[PDB]
Point group: D2
Chain length 295, copies 4
Amino acid sequence: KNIIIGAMTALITPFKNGKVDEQSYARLIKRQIENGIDAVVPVGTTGESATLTHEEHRTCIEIAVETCKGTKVKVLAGAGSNATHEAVGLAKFAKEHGADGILSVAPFYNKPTQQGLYEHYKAIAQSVDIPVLLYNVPGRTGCEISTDTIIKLFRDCENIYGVKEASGNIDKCVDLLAHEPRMMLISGEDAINYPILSNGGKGVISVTSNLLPDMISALTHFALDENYKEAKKINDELYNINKILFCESNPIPIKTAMYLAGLIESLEFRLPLCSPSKENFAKIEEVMKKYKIKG
Amino acid sequence: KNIIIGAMTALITPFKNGKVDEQSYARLIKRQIENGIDAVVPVGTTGESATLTHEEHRTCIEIAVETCKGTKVKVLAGAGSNATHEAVGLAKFAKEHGADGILSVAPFYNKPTQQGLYEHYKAIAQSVDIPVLLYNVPGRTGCEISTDTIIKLFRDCENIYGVKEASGNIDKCVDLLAHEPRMMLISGEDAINYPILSNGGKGVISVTSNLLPDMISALTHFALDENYKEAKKINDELYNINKILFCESNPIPIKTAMYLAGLIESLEFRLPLCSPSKENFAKIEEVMKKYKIKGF
Amino acid sequence: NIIIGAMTALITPFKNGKVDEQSYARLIKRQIENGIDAVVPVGTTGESATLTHEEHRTCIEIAVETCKGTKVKVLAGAGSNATHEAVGLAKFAKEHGADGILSVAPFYNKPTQQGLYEHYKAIAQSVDIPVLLYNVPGRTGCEISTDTIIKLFRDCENIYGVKEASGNIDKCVDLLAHEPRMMLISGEDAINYPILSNGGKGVISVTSNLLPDMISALTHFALDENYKEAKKINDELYNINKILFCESNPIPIKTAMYLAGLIESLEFRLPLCSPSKENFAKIEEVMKKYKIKGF
Amino acid sequence: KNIIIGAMTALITPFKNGKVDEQSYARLIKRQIENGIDAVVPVGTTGESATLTHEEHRTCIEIAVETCKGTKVKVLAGAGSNATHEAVGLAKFAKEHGADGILSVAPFYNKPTQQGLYEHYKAIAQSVDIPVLLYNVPGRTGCEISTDTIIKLFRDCENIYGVKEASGNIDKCVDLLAHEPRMMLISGEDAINYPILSNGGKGVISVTSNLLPDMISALTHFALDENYKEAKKINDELYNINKILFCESNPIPIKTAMYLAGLIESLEFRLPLCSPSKENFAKIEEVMKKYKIKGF
Ligand SMILES: N[C@@H](CCCC[NH3+])C(=O)O
Ligand SMILES: N[C@@H](CCCC[NH3+])C(=O)O
Ligand SMILES: N[C@@H](CCCC[NH3+])C(=O)O
Ligand SMILES: N[C@@H](CCCC[NH3+])C(=O)O
């Protein structure tokens, strides 16, 4: 099956005076390209997909597809929804508008059964032909795509090729690849990028890469090159930034970090997201003072 | 402060051929109305708000308002979203179209901070001049509105009057009312309706009441009338059905039970929701046999 | 035959390492002087884990003699994660004048529900005094399931109920809806009233070390079905009830006793120890809200 | 620091007629030595430490010490307790009767604070002069030794050299080795042996090695040799046995498997442990027969 692996970036969606800032967005994607990043994920969790209108969401996917066209870099379009008909709609759009594949989050809030999860993803996979990456983030969704379901879907569906794991559970990671070595396990948690990669994971979808695309890109390629000494080295030194970028909900801290680095104009969120508390603000800028940020 | 309390129902949304069965929807509300229900909650979690379009969502509110108009049964409209701008738009439609107040779920999925939660609700509360009931269901949303935030919202916003608590945390309920006895604590967890009411809760927003509106109605009014022995009696009897209705994700069992009772024509959901396992179907069917289920 | 009502998990006071036995008697007298219906020598609040049998059994004796000739009963701590030990403890408490035993679920070793049944069955059959089960999964690492609690209650005459310390009011509804004959005892102070209002017949309290009159009043107002008054006290008590667990029980309660001049010295036996300076201030501050009894 | 690393086995404690089968114990330890284990852990959790008397506890250690004498195999004695005086008492015997070091579990049930955990272990480490390995298993104890606490103990106490981690938390394993690279991180969770080792872990204390000591020792040695591909392969192969060895509480499945393998005479537990459900019995037999088991 066709895949999208390697060092991938969960793009922040910068805001300017309320509206999506289409210049910085298309610009930041270029900064990711010119820094060793293999793929970009428009409008994921980090891109505030919840606060974006279906039009704005569709716009960002299109921008991402258009800024990358003609490069090595791929676009993994965030197409998740807790309503299957929307997710399909977002899936069909990405395909008909030229994304390489889609990252489809597990339905949040409505807590579907494993059966419902299977049919949800089957419907999405069987309405496009592009690679589909599952996304398991139970802390946010209130639901867990079981290994059984994940593997079931991988086998039943031609274009479902893996899962972005952000469940903090390395046991599940071993479980996945022990019973199903053919799948692409993607790290969805920055602090444990290395352990996932060292167990056969084939890439990451990073938040930290927004700030430090070089460090994250190198880590993954070192790990993929099976240079575990160097990949662990980077993972170890990135531990502090990886943890501090979650002292409050992503993408709050990362945007704050992208702001302090001059990479974006305004520290601007769409409610219910907001700027962090001053304490966590102090903690971020301090940790930032320990790394070399490029622009 | 103006409020909406008593026996309330988280209305299921019946589908027929994929579309909302509006006649059936109106009819189910009538059944709730005539069985002692004080207010109805169109399009909550139980009404599959996640998979309705904004237009269907708005229609269900219209149907609910139209059906309760003339009765003193209030319409507490589900207006929550994980986007403040959506939540405000929904809250404004609810106001403009006759809803007596709204129910606003804590933002799900995007895990806002307590600061973000406060501003999210303040923005909503300032948008309309009708009662706003907070909704805390951390198991679904991935976030918890802390007791302190709840009390701040209640004290800072004139139309925020309470919270539907669905966390299975009785300590929190004790915490809420020990510090702010003026707020309306609403049970959103059927199994423990009585413990919440008996600690000062002033109503329930029930899933069970779709099937047994009379029993839930009587439970709440016994409790509200301080007849705790009779309220507890009913709560104990309802424990079986109260648990079985969550053998899978609400509203999967309740809709199955409604279908089994002949109260809705077809057992249809919108994906990712679907019919329960054949086993749970049999378990629900078996548990129903222990209860007198009022018809239309 | 049962033990219900307002019960106190007695603290075990230390002076220079050894159990201050005069302080123990004075405290127990103080509990009796304030309407407490039963005392629990050597519970978790009594630091059973760090005591020797020489002391575990000294304490029980003192409890028996101090209560000898009053209406106040003695529910001895007699639990262990080893059945042969718990049986020995059960037999001791009996052979030494205890009116009943409190038996915690086996901690650490995580027995099955089958094992939990065979454990308690062997305990109840060893002695002829009533046995109160103790469920505190946050401490033990296991939970006695509702079915297991009910089976034990039905299969053994002297198993008459359970001290519940799981903060799960649903389980309390479950237990009393299916087995309304058992004595559900509250083991979490903050939610004493909601448990009592659902048919609970008593509390085994930490706060009643400090405020025995109020806890005794609460429990008795609820037994008389004056739920209005029981709720008032429960609400007044919430703050002290919560602060008494700002650190692990019995660290805050012993600190409070010390601050109230009720024990000689703030002395724990390791691994327990003094609270942080911060929590010391918190505890001291919270205490001011309350009128505290002397001897 | 004096250390004890490598492939280690949490020894089962076989009972015949209620008493510790001393001869079978030595026979099992001998089998471990022959199949390449680096250390054995007498009377830990798997050793049913909870139900053994002090006489038996000490007896088991001495058997482990005397069997390992004249070999490279070390004895890491289980010597934890949730009372510091008893833990020091246990520690003092283990040191005086041959054990190369002690494994000391975090105080269970009484939940001491981080400050308490520090003073607990400091009192242990400064009362005997043999290596001490911390044991963090919060699911059994109810408390967690924080990363900061572990590093403080490592730095302020000469003979504390690392921690057996059985919390299924790889993030914590990263935090530990990233801030204190001299830490001897030992896997205490068989299913994640490889991921812990691949991050700089220096050993395992295995339940599975009782049954398959060759595979566990091969896994650990491969990982220490930077041969991650082969170490992962084995870990992947062992995943199912590593998981079903916990369908019921350890050491219930492992002892069952050892009995069905003919490695011990009888399947006796001391209460509150007991024989598994007859269905879990067949489950264990099923999984074990999918592996190659060494005799004596
Ligand atoms: N805020 C809603 C709608 C999002 C529409 C697509 N960006 C949600 O998170 O599901
Ligand atoms: N599916 C989106 C939009 C729902 C719109 C109708 N309530 C959500 O769950 O928020
Ligand atoms: N600390 C040991 C011994 C307690 C002795 C008194 N029962 C335990 O809790 O198991
Ligand atoms: N049940 C006690 C007994 C300890 C005796 C020495 N192993 C405990 O686990 O602490």
